A paper describes a structure:
In the present work, VP (isoenzyme VPL2) from Pleurotus eryngii has been subjected to protein engineering using a rational design strategy.
Based on these observations and considering that most ion pairs have a stabilizing role, a VP variant (VPi) containing eight substitutions (D69S/T70D/S86E/D146T/Q202L/H232E/Q239R/S301K) was engineered by introducing the residues involved in these interactions in the four targeted regions. Similarly, the two substitutions in region B strengthen the loop between helices H and I by interaction of the Arg239 guanidinium group with the Asp237 carboxylate (right), mimicking that observed between Arg245 and Asp243 in MnP4 (left). Regarding the region C, the introduction of a glutamate at position 232 in helix H promotes the formation of a salt bridge between this amino acid and Arg227 (right) emulating that observed between Glu238 and Arg233 in MnP4 (left). By contrast, the side-chain of Lys301 appears exposed to the solvent. The results revealed that VPi is significantly more stable than native VP at acidic and neutral pH.
Author numbering: 2 to 327
Write the structure that this text describes.
């Protein structure tokens, strides 16, 4: 404990500080909650969800890097191969497995985010053994049942799915509508805030680029894109309530995202042959901005889809509602 004099609870985890320091400088652009962080977060999902107790797949096993030429040609993995190519030199350079690195980079990346949380992290996943099977990654044009069943088959309850999707608060899309790459799922792609759950709950006005790409629904806001799957999920009897539940109190968004991610990172892996290295993850900057309806239009535009509970709705800020920049 440890070399720099930096510090953790179990010693096999000091291997992670050169990795951490390297990541922050050269992967994440001096550590910032931007594209490389978003794509790193997305990669933890596309690697780990590659798991089915019956259909096969090693889960959180680094397979999407180890067998990149195979998995990155899965149609559902469109746009992933660039972050794979981004991380490979760091995997090559260092002495942790591909699986560990993918999940480590995701954790670190989130902690960079304003409003972020620190996902627990474990060390010791073996090299991948085999490519994930195709057709295990939920696609944005899939039905709510299909998606709830895929995630469920991997072990998540429909409510765990809404929690994980808080990820989309720090998230954009390059491939859904190619003519508008880097267009986010909410107004604040740099901030881990509830804006995503709110803005997906507004009426859909327009298509931010070319109309009706597969998997795309109409957006409420120019400069923001909406997935068909987030739209359905927000309004479906099965997930509508918990979806609304997530409207401003970053607390539950932070608690639940942290713990379900921790759960996602262990798919196909076994926690008690791993060491806790969660202490290594950096402290995240506090939330800037309040969760607001994007002004201009009212609760007139919130499609309540939960009967049991009404809106948890703070009012909006002044006059118009302004741009959100891709
Ligand atoms: C459950 C069904 C899900 C569907 C249908 C879905 C769909 C998508 C799609 C279509 C994109 C845009 C990719 C692109 O065109 O550039 C995206 C981005 C993203 N996803 Fe999801 N996703 C799901 C779940 C998740 C989960 C569980 C996570 C947890 C980590 C996650 C994290 C992210 C992140 C961080 C991005 C940002 C990509 C970027 O900024 O480049 N998603 N998702
Ligand atoms: Ca995998
Ligand atoms: Ca956000
Ligand atoms: Mg599908
Ligand atoms: Mg991207």
């Amino acid at each position: 404990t440890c070399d720099d004099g930096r510090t953790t609870a179990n010693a096999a985890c000091c291997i992670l500080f050169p990795i951490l320091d390297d990541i922050q400088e050269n992967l994440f652009d001096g550590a910032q909650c931007g594209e490389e962080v978003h794509e790193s977060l997305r990669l933890t999902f596309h690697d780990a969800i590659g798991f089915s107790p019956t259909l096969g797949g090693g889960g959180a096993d680094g397979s999407i890097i180890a067998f990149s030429d195979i998995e990155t040609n899965f149609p559902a993995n469109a746009g992933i191969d660039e972050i794979v190519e981004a991380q490979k030199p760091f995997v090559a350079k260092h002495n942790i497995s591909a699986g560990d690195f993918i999940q480590f980079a995701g954790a670190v990346g989130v902690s960079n985010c304003p409003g972020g949380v620190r996902i627990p992290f474990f060390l010791g996943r073996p090299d991948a053994v085999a490519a994930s099977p195709d057709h295990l990654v939920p696609e944005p044009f899939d039905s709510v049942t299909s998606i709830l069943a895929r995630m469920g088959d991997a072990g998540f309850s429909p409510v765990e799915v809404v929690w994980l999707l808080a990820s989309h608060s720090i998230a954009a899309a390059d491939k859904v509508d190619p003519s508008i790459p880097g267009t986010p799922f909410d107004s604040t792609p740099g901030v881990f805030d509830s804006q995503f759950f709110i803005e997906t709950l507004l009426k859909g006005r327009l298509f931010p680029g070319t109309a009706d790409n597969k998997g795309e629904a109409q957006s409420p806001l120019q400069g923001e894109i909406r997935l068909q799957s987030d739209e359905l999920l927000a309004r479906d009897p099965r997930t509508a309530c918990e979806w609304q539940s997530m409207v401003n109190n970053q607390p539950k968004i932070q608690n639940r995202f942290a713990a379900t991610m921790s759960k996602m990172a262990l798919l196909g892996q076994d926690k008690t042959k791993l060491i806790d290295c969660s202490d290594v993850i950096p402290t995240p900057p506090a939330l800037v901005g309040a969760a607001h309806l994007p002004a201009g239009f009212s609760l007139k535009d919130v499609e309540q889809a939960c009967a049991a509970t009404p809106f948890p709705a703070l009012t909006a800020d002044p006059g118009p509602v302004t741009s959100v920049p891709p």
